[PDB]
Point group: D5
Chain length 156, copies 10
């Protein structure tokens, strides 16, 4: 039977315990996700309290991180989502994504309505991935792909 959380702090406390174990074992998110059949972004989100793992995935990552039974069960709970402490991130790495919305948020709205129509690009019927690539000018770039379903707003 599906189970869900209502207070984010239970899963966020579990996340901190996970990260400590992870650091002690010197593991990567890539290797934790290996063998689950699931995308690195999805598994990582789950570890960090923002997705639920199916039972087999939770047992696998639980074994890798030496997690107790309560914790393996908690990982399967549908979370009370919201990773930002207090609305606006303080961390520079997180903040930059917020700044992309402060600069381009209204452009995204405008071009979504022009290209698709009234409605939204879904954060639910949705996937994301992160790739590292050389910058032709030197250094490296991230190519982060947001891939969401268009859900129309129609009159009724």
């Amino acid at each position: 039977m599906i189970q869900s959380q209502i207070n984010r702090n239970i899963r966020l406390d579990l996340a901190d315990a996970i990260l400590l174990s992870k650091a002690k074992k010197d593991l990567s998110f890539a290797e934790i996700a290996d063998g689950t059949g699931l995308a690195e972004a999805f598994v990582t989100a789950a570890l960090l309290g923002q997705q639920a793992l199916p039972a087999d995935a939770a047992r696998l990552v639980g074994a890798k991180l030496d997690l107790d039974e309560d914790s393996i069960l908690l990982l399967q709970m549908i979370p009370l989502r919201g990773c930002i402490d207090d609305r606006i991130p303080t961390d520079p790495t997180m903040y930059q994504f917020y700044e992309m919305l402060q600069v381009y948020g209204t452009t995204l709205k405008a071009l979504v309505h022009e290209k698709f129509g009234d409605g939204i690009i879904s954060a639910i019927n949705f996937k994301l991935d992160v790739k590292k690539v050389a910058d032709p000018e030197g250094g490296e770039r991230a190519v982060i792909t947001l891939d969401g379903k268009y859900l129309p707003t129609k009159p009724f």
Copy 2:
């Protein structure tokens, strides 16, 4: 000589005027940008107060939209950027992008640090674009590509 703004309301009020003109002329953002040599996302952002147009582009869009000279000059000013009225978007279309950050913000942080290192993906050395792709299961998806330079944080 470069000119800059300090009160976003001057360019945001201009944005509303531009949008009224645009609607009266039944024009698209694609057609406004066509001929400037600049990407639609850039030109659109400038119209909406989040980027500066070079003089020629300002005159070109100014002609298309029947703008006055003060408006054409304002478009060339470096803006006081920030398109969200009060931190958290109210508009569903815009909010969904904020929700992507509430769900994946910490994952983005975690995977940036694993793939690149300490530091940030830049919103300055940065571009984005929006593409419509057919969803195999029916309907349409938006593929939004965030493309940002990695700037490392190193000891000194």
Copy 3:
């Protein structure tokens, strides 16, 4: 060509002008929506700046309310939605609905996950209606039906 707003105040100022005209003519929302082919809640939301009207509906309500051409045009624009002045309504009538969420929000989440699964009940693929019904015990009740699509959250 579709047109969209980025500052809610343009359509909110239009809403106030609409309401003054409505009052001067002593019209009801029921009578304004009649003949549009659209639900009273949808048309009303449009007048109040929270939905877009198709052109024929915009011209029709514009005739009833004696709106100028710019106003008729504005009603067809995709709005920057968000009716609540500052996050939490101050008006008692509006506040009661927010209180429903303060008492039942987490119950809604839990029951949605149990009955449907991980994911959301959509406010986009969505309809609302308000019915007045006599209370068997004396007085009147409102039956407000929220009717939203289930969109699942699945691993990837």
Copy 4:
């Protein structure tokens, strides 16, 4: 003698404990409420700290979940209600209901005054329920019924 709470955290801490037991026992809210004579929404709300259980119902759910006496007592206290952590929900599932208010809030006000008069639709003399209905276009919808008494505002 009736007993009441003044700090929501006592009952919200209990809720988390309840949710862990419920998960360990692989129980549903449906099952837990069955046998109490109380609506599933009402019982679930009580477990989640937003309603008080009558003594018999508290003892019944208490047995199912293996709760200690103090917990069974706490379930019977009139709660300090307010399930949302910090005014605006972060969780997508809960947020969609807030968005319904951001889109339709002023419409609900307007149509309530039109249909009933000045005053409110009550969140106190109030029932809600969640029903799953097949969507003719495929998949599933939730029909959530908010059923509140009209309380008039009259001159005095």
Copy 5:
């Protein structure tokens, strides 16, 4: 047909104009409410944007204050209520009432539940009045009576 507002600033701007007229005519709130058949507190609240006046009351106070027709019509509209600029009053006179709630709010909850039961004392089925009385120790006291219906919260 009943008419309602959605932007408090319209009626609050009218309140400021009413107050200037009132001061120029050197009128009291008691004199303005006189003849109206309505309580001083109700009529005053209406002038200040927090109640609607019945048509005859509006015309009567409109005559006293020399209001134009748009204003007499506005006073009949159901308001978007909320007199506090930004949640917490700055004005010492208003603040003291908020302080009463900071000191006694939980006591009022506790004693309402003990004396009446679960539920609320209504701010809708509600009367307020202010009396001036001598303090037996010297000076003067306000006796402010909050008279609200008990609305029970009952299981379902």
Copy 6:
């Protein structure tokens, strides 16, 4: 020698402990205050962290509730007052009193100035009480009397 608090959490935590003891003993506020010589609203406010008990009353209520010596001493401290968790109450029972201020705050100011003069009605030289009165139309009403000294603001 008088003793005072600077952090409300110490007395608020004691209040939760007091309420758990009260509930285990199935005691009422009326019976806890009875015998102290102090008004029920005052004693209740003390228990809930918003007033100081004199030593004898502290020992009396401490015997009734089986409190330890540090707790009995804490009850005698002048509190750091403020019962509302985060400025605006979330609990419907407490919120209704806030709403009375959102509706009637400016009216209270205006009528206080008219009847008394510039200055305040004091929340310090102040008492309150709650009386249950039959509603002639059916049910029960609370008459809550706020009784405060007028303190004038005069030129100097």
Copy 7:
């Protein structure tokens, strides 16, 4: 008959006009308050929207500043007080007084309770003055005297 305001912006807009006139005439606050028989701090506060002037003083300052009749009447109204734009001052001069409260607020509470007892030092039965005194170490000091009545909090 006493008259009062409910929106601070009316008197704050007047204050700005007063300050421009004052600057054009190169007047001091000392000389504006001369002849009024009132303290410079009181009269100045009135000009800046935080006190009411008696009629004679209003006419006198109105003459000196070339104010129109509506402005002279406005100066006589009891204000909606609150001079800080958004709770915490931005201006360094004003912020230093707020910092004094951030450093010494709890000390003030503690020493007030010890020296006087439970209750408050009043901001209403109150005066303040600003004196310049030479610093023996070089330069100048301000000695700002806050003089307020002790109002006791007593059991009842």
Copy 8:
């Protein structure tokens, strides 16, 4: 070597422990500061976490209050100052001082600039004291003296 704090809670938690000890020993702030050679306002502020005590004063107060060594060392640390829990005080005693700034803040700014010039009255080069004086009309007054260095803002 000088030592400093960055999280206020460590010293605030210590303050609470100090206050319990103080109350158990029935001590006054006056008695605790006696023999330190330092002003009671300064010593009190230190105990409450807003100043650092010199080693000899820390040891003297620590013996009076039976503090452990870690506590005596903590009192000598330079604090992370800020005594107000959340910007605006909730406590009536502390709030009245914030209200003096809401009423007179701008007047203080204006008179400081007139009497001294551009710049600030310092909260750093600063002392305060609280004196009790009889009120001729009956009762007691607090004369609180804020004594700060004028620091000019000069062009460069």
Copy 9:
């Protein structure tokens, strides 16, 4: 006679007008400050509402910008300082300086106390400047120097 502002919007509106004139005349801040004898940072801050210009400097920049007499007079007023719209900058250029504080704020506190002692580095007895320096690895750097007087916090 020195004159001061209490509402920042007056000078911030003037700043907008100045910037439009500056842009029309294609002027730089460097050339506007030239001839004034005042640092570029100081003059610029004045134009932007954050400093007061001496009379001669006001007349000089006024001539360059073609300002009217009221504008020249406003530039000499001591401002109500505070350039950030709502506490945290939205603009990326301004935000980075805030971020410097989020990362290094506690380090600045710690090192200031170590190097100097208890107290502050002054924002009043303060200057700043911005220099451009070539980056040895390519591109350009800004070396921004914050130069503030140490003011000690001493016991009393």
Copy 10:
């Protein structure tokens, strides 16, 4: 493998433990950073939870402070940065840096744009140092050098 944090409190609690140990050993930040091969400002920021130490540096500071293995591992994790408790510092020492931004933030924007162009001065490609220098007029100054890369914002 690189390891990162997502909850600032883990490292902030570590910071507090570090500062206790540091105080018990009577150590300076200068001495702690000595031998590390890294700048005092960088090492200090790491201790305070705002930077990551390389392994050797972490082991060395760990030896000087007698940290346990978990603590030495935590120091190597990339932090969830953000040292300010709640956006605006309450501590006077930290606040003054924020005030610098309230006075000069817009000037910094304007001058950055003029001297470099559109874009930012980076807080990432960035170093900071604090130098104590005698003031020629008497006393001491801090010279705080902010040294950041210019990152241009270019059209595309």
